[PDB]
Amino acid sequence: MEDDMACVKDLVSKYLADNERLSRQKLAFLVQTEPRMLLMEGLKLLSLCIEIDSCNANGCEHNSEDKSVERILHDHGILTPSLCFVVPDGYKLTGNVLILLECFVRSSPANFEQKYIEDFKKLEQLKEDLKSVDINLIPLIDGRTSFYNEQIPDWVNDKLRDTLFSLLRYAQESNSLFEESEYSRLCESLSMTSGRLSGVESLNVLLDNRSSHYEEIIASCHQGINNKLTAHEVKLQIEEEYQVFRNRLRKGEITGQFLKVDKSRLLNDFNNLYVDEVTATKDNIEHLIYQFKRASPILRFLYANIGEGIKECQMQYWRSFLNKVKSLRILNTRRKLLLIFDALILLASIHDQTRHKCSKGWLGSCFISVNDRLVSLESTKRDLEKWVGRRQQSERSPPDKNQILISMFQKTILKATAALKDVGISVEHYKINMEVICPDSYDLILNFDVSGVVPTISYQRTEDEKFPFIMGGVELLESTDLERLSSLSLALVNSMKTSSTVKLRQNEFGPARYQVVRCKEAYCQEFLLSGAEFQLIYQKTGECSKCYAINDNRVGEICSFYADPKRYFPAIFSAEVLQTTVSTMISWVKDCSELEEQLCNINSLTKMILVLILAHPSKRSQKLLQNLRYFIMAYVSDYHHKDLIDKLREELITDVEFLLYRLVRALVNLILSEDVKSMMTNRFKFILNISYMCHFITKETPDRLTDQIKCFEKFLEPKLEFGHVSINPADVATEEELDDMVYNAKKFLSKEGCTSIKGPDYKKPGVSKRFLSLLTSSFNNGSLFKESEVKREIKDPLVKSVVVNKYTDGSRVLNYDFNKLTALAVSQLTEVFSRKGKHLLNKQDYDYKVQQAMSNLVLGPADLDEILLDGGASVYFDQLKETVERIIDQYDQPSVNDLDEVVPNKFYIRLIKGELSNHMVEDFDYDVLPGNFYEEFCDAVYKNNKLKERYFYCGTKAVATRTYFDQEYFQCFKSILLIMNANNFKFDMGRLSDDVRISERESNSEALSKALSLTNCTTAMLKNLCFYSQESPQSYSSTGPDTGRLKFSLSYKEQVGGNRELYIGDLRTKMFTRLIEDYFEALSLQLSGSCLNNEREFENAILSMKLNVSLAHVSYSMDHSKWGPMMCPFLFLATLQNLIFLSKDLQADIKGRDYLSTLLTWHMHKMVEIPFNVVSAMMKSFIKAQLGLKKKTTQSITEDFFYSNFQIGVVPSHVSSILDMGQGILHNTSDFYALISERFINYAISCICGGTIDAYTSSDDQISLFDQVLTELMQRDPEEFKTLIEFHYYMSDQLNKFVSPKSVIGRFVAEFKSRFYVWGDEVPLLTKFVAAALHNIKCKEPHQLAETIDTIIDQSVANGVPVHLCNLIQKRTLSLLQYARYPIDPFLLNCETDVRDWVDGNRSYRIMRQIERLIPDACGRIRSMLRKLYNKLKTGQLHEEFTTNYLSSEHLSSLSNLCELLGVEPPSESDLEFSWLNLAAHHPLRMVSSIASGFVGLCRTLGSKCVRGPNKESLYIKSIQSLISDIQGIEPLIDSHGVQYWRVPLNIRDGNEGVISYFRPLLWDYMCISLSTAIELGAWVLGEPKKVRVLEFFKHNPCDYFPLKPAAGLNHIIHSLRRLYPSVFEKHILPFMSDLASTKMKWSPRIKFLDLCVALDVNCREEHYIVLSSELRLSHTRTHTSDAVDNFMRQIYFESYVRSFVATTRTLGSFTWFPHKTSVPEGEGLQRLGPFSSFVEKAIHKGIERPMFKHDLMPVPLVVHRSGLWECDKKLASFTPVVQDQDLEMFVKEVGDSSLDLLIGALSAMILDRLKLRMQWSEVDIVSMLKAAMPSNSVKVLNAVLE
RNA sequence: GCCUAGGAU
RNA sequence: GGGAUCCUAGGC
Ligand SMILES: [Zn+2]
Incomplete structure (x- = not known):
């Protein structure tokens, strides 16, 4: 810790600016050693710096020696009688007036004003005495809120602040030094504020350590380039390059890469595109439609001809009851559970049959028993016989089989009921009959004979003859096929709710078990088409692809196929939509006279396409449709890329795709039909919308493994030709890697062109030095800007999942073990063999024997091995055997299992484990268990000392220990759980499956917590969690910081077509990247053209586009290939190190540039990981091929790349190359590069020709808008236009930017971000929005999907979709919801919408509309009542007797109180009786990826207790339905579409408060919603609705639109x-x-x-709405900065009277009403500033902090007096805005509260000085204003002021 | 492969 | 990607 004070002392000695006025405290700080001394001296130094900076910025000389105002005045030559001792922090004198000062720092508005008022009172209490010597005092105060001074670099500032706080953080010292008040004040003063700068300059708190490897890189990046060339010069190089290029091209040495277009050739090649197996020349529609219907199982079933044709039985009740019993895991599934459960339903059906001859629930010998299972009858009889026989033998080794059987029955049923009656309800709803079990049944069982059909499931393919019906009977123009498809798809989707059961019969014994199989069967689902029923049959549950079979009763097994449950979703219940889609689609092209005849054929074809999409949805059929768009794009163009057609040839496997190809080819040949010319736009729209019929399938992935292998190959394969692939680069970089890095960095810039014996070689990475120098120089010479830049110099740009690593030591693992992986692979292979391989190969094949040997090797139960040796593979096994043998030989903290130590009856434990496996602990049910059980468990846990101390605290265990004694057992049980943290292989497999990983994953915030909790400032800020925190490194090499290098990881993001890559980082990589991202984005924000982040650019782009297509100017729509994996950070660094920004300043520039260089240098050395499954599968392929078990296809290059390194030892783990840029990480810098490069290229092309070009960009796409000249030239000299395009291609390629073959050039369209445009007409996108809206449902509260779909539909409608479609979709959604039977409230969704209901309505306005439609003759007066109420309220008449009197108050008769408070008759007595059932009136509904799984989850959740009690309980929905159905005064009501709403009487409104607690009346909600919406929107929404009949029909051409704008301090x-x-x-x-x-x-x-x-x-x-003026008729219509500147003016004027204050740059800006450099133009309110205009410009709006002088109106400072400005005893100018009644009201309220004479004096002075200018007061009043302000004493104040 | 009793899914 | 039985003990 001593090093901390040492280094900070070094800093403060070094970086402190030279000033002797800081020397003194400097000394006092540079000598102490005691901590407390250092903290005191440092804080005093900081406060001294603050006050010095303040006194400088204000203009008052610094009182250094800390004098006293008495002395301060007496040594200045004046007399002072006596004062109280005060210490100023600065002062100044001017003639007879004085200015003081005082400053401090507070970071909380609560603890801020205190110091202010204290200083003000301490100053006035001296001013009162000073007044008697004829001297004026002006009490200035300053209130800075940050210690970020100006004489100190800020990074030093916080580096000092945090070390001071740490030294201050001595617990014992802090305690035994002071109390909690000053402690709390100080700790929040060193708060580690985010500051005012970027957040990377903090780099200067760490060492350099940049020894040698960092030099040659910079040199190379700076060696060959010449970034100084003059403006004129570049023209010479450009011209020379253009000349030599044209010359070497025209002679035919280079290709042309661009072709002109002709419709003939295009059609011919599109037809003969796949010409190797589509043996066809022409096409007849009839043969097509003929052989379609007989294509494939589903199709041959749809259009077939079938079906020319309630009992309360005793087979359902039993079944429901047994299902419910099975659900709860009561019974031990043991040696024979389900057999008796099958016998019981057998007896049930037997009994039920002989009473009413039921004909249901049976197929041949089959009956749906318990869990959708379809058992036979014979094997049942056999197993029952064997069971009773061996049971009789067990009785031997007297009774008859009847007796023992009925004994077992009685035992199991008695145990069932006994367990059920603990908690579960009983037969009360389960209306069953105990007569089913006859006193003898086994005989009656053995005498049951039913005949019929047999069920079969055929796996392998068949011939087209087993179909016992007539194929073509249905018709296209009718809509039966769609409904059959809906039914089948729903029967499919429903195949997921099954739970993984335990099978009974293995059903086969032999390799024929994949050939046609029928002994028993398995699960089955039911569905009806129109008449009879059908069974859909499968074998194994889950959501994996499998087989199926469609069984019927009159005939068996109509077909079978290989579908997969998911991905079939977006067809259910949506039949009347698709038909309407096709109809409105056709509706466009139906007036082309030249197409009158065969139009009906087009209809069939369209319909057929759709059904095919729906019938056979598959991956490689999407791309074929998608690619079609590019073809049609090329058709209307002028020039297309040379190699285009060879793109649309991906891969086809089975036939169906070729059928689709033939269909679409026929349709295109018919629509295009070169001898027709009439309607081009409509046919364009038609084909284009046909191309988007691809989203209909799904967006998911078919597989996982072969989806990862593809992306990994995409990643690796291009990084190998370049010849640089490093492997396992350790954190300490050896020399060879650095050498190779230097060599590759040199190679990268070794590109050349047009001056060589070889010429340019496209499609290879790298940049040439010539063009890079030209770019840099032309940029530095300012030849790439405009007036918006030359006048605004670029200000300094400095003003999901995350991976968690592993650890074994200080180091971190970075390489999987070899032999561990070998063992893993072997194990997996053994598993695959044991599951399926053993039932396919013969026993006399060598591969089978090998697998057998390896399995009996790995688990427990040589001539063949000799032949193996002769088959080459000898030593492999010799080693591998012992390796894996030795690998296998090598192998009290409170937890969950401890439950088994307390609860003997395990059934309770299974219950609890389920409940937890469904819901969280916080919302656990109270009634899962007996009430006594909780108390007994708490007792049995508190007894046993072990678990007691494990969860009780004897000294979170506190809350439980306390609560147990208080006997709130439920909170105790929940707490003990909240501690419990519930939220034949001879070795351990899971440990192995975890050891040979490396990286794990975690959410976004789970790691952000564990980070932020381990640091001081609990406010998450960027530069606080990596710089100033525990566990951060000290210095850094040329590679990375001492924590290590910048890891990553790989995955895929899926879309339509293909899948893009996804890099994933750790916390530090994200933290460091974010800085570069923010920097480059802030920098790009100054320059015009980018469109990745902004919005007000994209609309300018759209406007420019729309404007372009009116004069036929030649648009150019481009793209770019391999943008991601062919960019390199080396290039960014190289072009940066040559960039020279603003040339006024000197050093901070190079500081920033060096920082960025270091950051990019770190980034260049990333270590991308490799996924696990990829490695496993490739190792599997390797170990196969070694023995060559099943020779696969010929290996690609990746497999060899692996096997080479694999059969030497090392297993490749990490790869750290140079070539690849992150895919999606370094976006903004890439956009910056693209923008600059494109601008330079357009500049060059301007330089050559005589035109101009305008462009844009987002991330890789682009447009180009050829000027008038470059357009009009194209029609005379095609050679020159083509050579211009070619030179553009060449240039743009030189700078490492390619062009994809899908770009086009045209005069008829313009594409950008997938938003097409044409002249005159506009192009909607129907199919895209429809297919999007069809599947957007998840497992949320059913009140959220509502607004979801409403948002989607609102977005769609704006793009020409017709509203009828929207109503159909809404009805479809409502029906999908009703399928689960959620009782529909009134306001769930409005399935009646019109064209006015979107462009001028909110999410709720439509609710009001449905209600208005529901129950009229009541709202018909409520509207007028609310109208009067709102009209009265808007002018503020009562304005309080509603909110604090009615709204919160009980809605009992408040309505009538309003109607009497306004004078209109209240509603009837049979009005209040309307209401609507609201579930969850206490707490929201509790809840328990993909889409299908989401829908089945939503279908499941409802049932299981979606109800919370009064406090906390659980119920159902059927329960509440019954409990409403009891009360015989409650009458429901339905509408056509279906909207439940009720009628309940006020007579029993109380007196039965049991279930009525949920209901809520309707007119109340209507009123409040209406008032809210009216306040929000325009008040016109309270007119009177009406329907118009003022129109006659008008011939509506299908294409006609009318844009619209929506109707809205x-x-x-x-x-x-x-x-x-x-x-x-x-x-x-x-x-x-x-x-x-x-x-x-x-x-x-x-x-x-x-x-x-x-x-x-x-x-x-929501800028505009685009709709058809053929719909705008049938509708309804309803019947109805200067401020800020004047506010600041009045603020100043009002403050001028309360006291006196100096006028400076800190007084004015301290207020709130001020234009603080917001979005304000040059002159907006500059007229309303009087004598203050120039100051804002000359001082405030430049960044100049100085006091006010006399030279600021056109050396004493200015003083703001009452109204007018005053210098020392003279007035110069003044200013006075206008006043209002309300302003004076607020004034006299806030000022006249406590004191009076102040208000009197202020008002008298205002009146005086406003009279002598002769303004007029007749515009306002006085007396009534006083009364309304002072309601009790206005008379005396009137007399006082008027006197 | 079977019966009884239980445990795990 | 496409059929679920495992352990311990007791009587056998
Ligand atoms: Zn019946």
């Missing part, structure tokens, strides 16, 4: 917050963004409306 809000709720205000706005502790507000206008609005609220963009 923060300082005052903040004022009211600080005036009403101070505690909430200080802790939520000041630390967020504010510093206004030293600010006054005692003179500010007030508003009553806003005040009461805020009191209620605390008590209780």
Whole structure:
């Protein structure tokens, strides 16, 4: 700790500015050794610096020797009788007036004003005495709120502050030095404030340690470049390059890379694109539609022809009851559970049959028994026979099988009921019959014969003949297929609620167990199409791809397939949507005369496409549709890339895709049809929207492993050609790695072009020195700016999951073990063999025997091994055997298992474990267990000393120890759990599966806590958690800080098409990157053109675009490939080290540049990790290929790259190359680079030709808007235009920026960020928004999905979607919700919306509309009543007799009280009876990824106790339904769409408060919602609704639009917050963004409306819309800075009268009403400043802190007197704004509270000095104002003022 | 492979 | 990716 004081003493000796006035305390601090002495001297030094800086900035000389005002005056030559001893911190005299000063620091507005008022009273108590010598005193006060002075570098400042606080943090010393008051004041003074600068300059508190490796890098980055070239010079180089390029090109030495377009060739190649197996020339629609319906199982089932055709049985009740019993894990699943449970349902069906001849619940020999299981009957009889036989033998080794069977039945049923009756309710709802069990049944069982069909499931494919129906019977134009598909998809989705059961029959014995299988069956689901039923059958549960089978009763097993439950979602219940989609889509192109005939064919084709998408959803069918957009984009263009068509040829596997290809090719050939020309825009829209029919599938991933391998290959494969791949770089970098790094850094800049015997070689990384020098020089010469930059010099730019590492020692592991991994792989392989491999290969194959040997090796139960030796593989096993043998030979803190030591009946424990496995501890149920059990458990735990001290404290155990004695057992049980932290292999597998990892993961905040808790300032700030904290390093090498290097990790982010990469960091990597990110973004913010962060740029982009397509100017829409993995931080550093910013200052520039150099140098050395499963799978491939068990495909380069390093020893773990930039990490710097480079390139092209170009960017995309000249030239000299484009390609390639083959050039479209535009018409996107809105449901409260879908629909409607679609979607969602039977309240969603209900409505306005529609003739007067009420209130007549009198008050008859307080008749007596059931009127509903799983979770959660009691309990929803159904005065009511709302009588409104506690009346909610919305929106929403019939039909062309705008002081809000709720205000706005502790507000206008609005609220963009003017008719319409400147003026004027204050840069700015350099133009309120205009400009709006002199109006300072400005005994000028009644009211309120003579004198003086200027007072009153202000004594004050 | 009793899912 | 039984003891 001594080193701390040492180094800080060194700093304060060095960096302290030379001034002898600091020397004294300097000495006093540089000599002490006692801690307390050092703290005192340091704090005194800091306060001295503060007061010095203050007295300098104000203009008062520093009282150094600490004189006294008596002495201060008497040594100045005046007489002073006697004073009280006061010590000033500075003073000054001017003639007969005096100026004092006093300053301090306080960081809390509560403890701020105290010092202010104390100093003011201490000064006035001396002014009163001073007044009698004819001398004026002016008591200045200053209130700085930070110790950040100006004579001291700030990093030294806080480096001193924190070490002082630490030395002060001696516990014993702090205690035995002072009390808690001053301790608390001091600790919050060294608060480690975030300061005013960036947060990286703190680097200067650490060593350099930059010995040798850091030099040559900078040299190379600075060696060849020449960043000084003049402006004119660059023209020469540019011209020479252009000339040599054109010359060497025209002679045909380089390619052309660009082709002109022709529709013929494009169509021809698009047709013959896949021409190797689509043996077709032309296409007939008829044969197509014919062979479609007979394609594949689902299709052949849909369009088929089937189905030309309540009992309260005794098979359901039993089943429901047994299901419920099974749910709770009561019974021990042991040697034979489910068999008896099957026998019981067998007897149930037997009994039920012979009474009413039921025909249900049966397929051949099958019956859905318990958990959707479909058992046979024969094997049941056999196993029952065998069971009773061996049981009789056990009785032998008397009774008959009947007797023992009924005995078991009686025993199990009795145990069942006995367990149930502990807590569970009984037969009361379970209406069962104990006659089912006959006194003899086993015989009756053995005499049951049913005949029928047999069930089968066929795995392998078949032929198209086992289908016993007639294929083509349905028709396209009808909508049966969609409903069949909906039903089937729902039957699929529902296949997840099954729980993993325990099978009964292995069902097969032999390798045919994957061939057609039928002995028994397994689980099954039920669904109805129109008439009869159908069973859907599967075998194993979960959510993994498997087989299925569709069984029926009249025939067996219509088909079978290979689907997967998820990914089939977005079709359920949505049938009348898709049809409407297709219809409105067709509706566009239906007027093309040249297409009149075969139009119906188009219809069929469109429909067919959609059904195909829905029937066979698969990965590689998405990209085919997506890529289509680029083709159509190319069609309308002019020039396209040379190598385009070879992109749309990815990969196809099975047939269906080729069917889709043929269909779409036919449709394109028919739509395009070169001999038709009429409607181009509509066909454009049609095809384009057809291309977006890809989102309909899903966004998820098909697999995991082969999804990770792809991304890993994408990562690695391009970093190998360049020839630089390091491996396992240790934290201490050896020399060879540094050497290779230098060599590669040199190689990177070795690019060349157009001057060589080889010419340019595209598609290879690197930058050439010529172009880089040209760029840098042309940038430094200011040849890339405009007036918005030359006039504004660039100010200094300095003013999810996270990985947790492992640890074995000081070091950190970085390499997996070899032999451990070998053992792991072997084990896994043995598992794979044991599960499936053993049932596929023959026993006389060598591979089978090998696997057998390796399995009996690894677990417990040579001529073959000799042949193995002859098969080469000899030594591999010889070593591996002993290796893994030795690996396998090598292998009281309170916990959860201890429960088994207390609770003997385990069933309770299983209950508890389930409940915890569902809900948190905080919301555990009270009634899961018997009430006595809690007390008995608490007793049995408090007895046993062990667990007692393990959870009780004898001296969080405190809260439990205390509560147990007080006998609140439930809180005790919950607490003991909150401590419990519940929230044949011969070795241990899990330990191995954990040892051979390296990195683990954690959430965002779980680590932020564990960080912030281990430091002083518990306010999370950037530069506090890595610089000044425990566990941080001291110095740093050229590689990284002494903690280590910058790790990372890999994963994938999924989208449509392919998947992008995802880097993940640790805490430190994030913390350090964030600084560079913020820096570069702040820097880019000054320059115009970027569009990644801003908003008001993107709209300018859109406006420029829309403007471009009116004159046919040639747009150029680009893109960029491999942007991520082909950028390098070396390039950023190199272009930075040559950047020269503002040239006025000298050093801080290079300081920042060096800091950034160090940061980038750290970043260049990252150590990317490699995932685990990738390594496991590749090792598996290796160990296979070694023996070559199953020869796979020919290995790519990655497998060899691995195996090479693998069969030498080392297993590759980390790779640290140079070539790759982070993918998504270093965004802002990449955008900066792209912007600068693009501007330079456009500059060059301007230099060559005679035109201009405008561009933009987000991260890699771009546009280019050719000027008029470059457009109009293109039509005469195509050669020159093409060569310009080519030279652009070349140049832009030289700077390491490529162009993807999908860019285009055109005159008819313009693309940006996927937002297309055309002339005249506009292009919507229907399919995208529809497919988005179809699946956006998760497992939240059903009151949130409402606003979710409402937001989605509001966003969509703005883009030309027609509203009918939206209503259909809303109805679909409501039906999906009703499927779970959640009783729909009134306001859940408004399924009636219109076109006015979005463009001018909120989320709730539509609620008001549905209510208005529901129950009229009541609101028809409530509206007028609220209208009168609001009209009266808006002018503030009562303004309080409603909020604090009615709103909070009990809504009992308050309405009638309003109606009598306003004079309108109250409602009827049969009005209050309306209400609406609200679940969760006490506490929100308790709750217990993907989408399907989310939906099944939401479907499950409802049932299981979604109800909280009065205090805390649990119930159901059916319960409350019954308990309402009891009371015979409660009448429900429904609407057409379905909206429950009730009628309950006021006569029993009380007297039965049991269930009625939930209900809530409707008109109350209507009133309050209406008032709130009206206050918020425009008050026009309280007219009278109406429907119009004033229109005749007009021929509505399908494309016609009409843009629209929606129909709509923060300082005052903040004022009211600080005036009403101070505690909430200080802790939520000041630390967020504010510093206004030293600010006054005692003179500010007030508003009553806003005040009461805020009191209620605390008590209780969307630019344009684009719609069709063919809809705008059928609707309804309803019937109805200068301020701030004048506020500051009146504030100053009012303060001028209360006292006298000096006018300086700190007095004025200290107020609140002031334009503190906000968004204000040059001249806005400068006319309303009088004598203060120039000061704001010349002084305030430049950063100049000085006092006011006489030269500031056109050497004594100025004094603000009453109204007019005064110098020493003379007036120069004045100013006086206008006053109002309310301002005077607030004035006389706040001033005339305690004293009187002050108000009288002030008013008299104001009247006097305002009369002598002859202004007029006739505009206001006096007497009534006084009365309204002083309600009891206005007479005497009237007399006083008027006298 | 079976019966009884229990434990774990 | 596509069929769930494991341990200990007692009588066998
Ligand atoms: Zn029946």
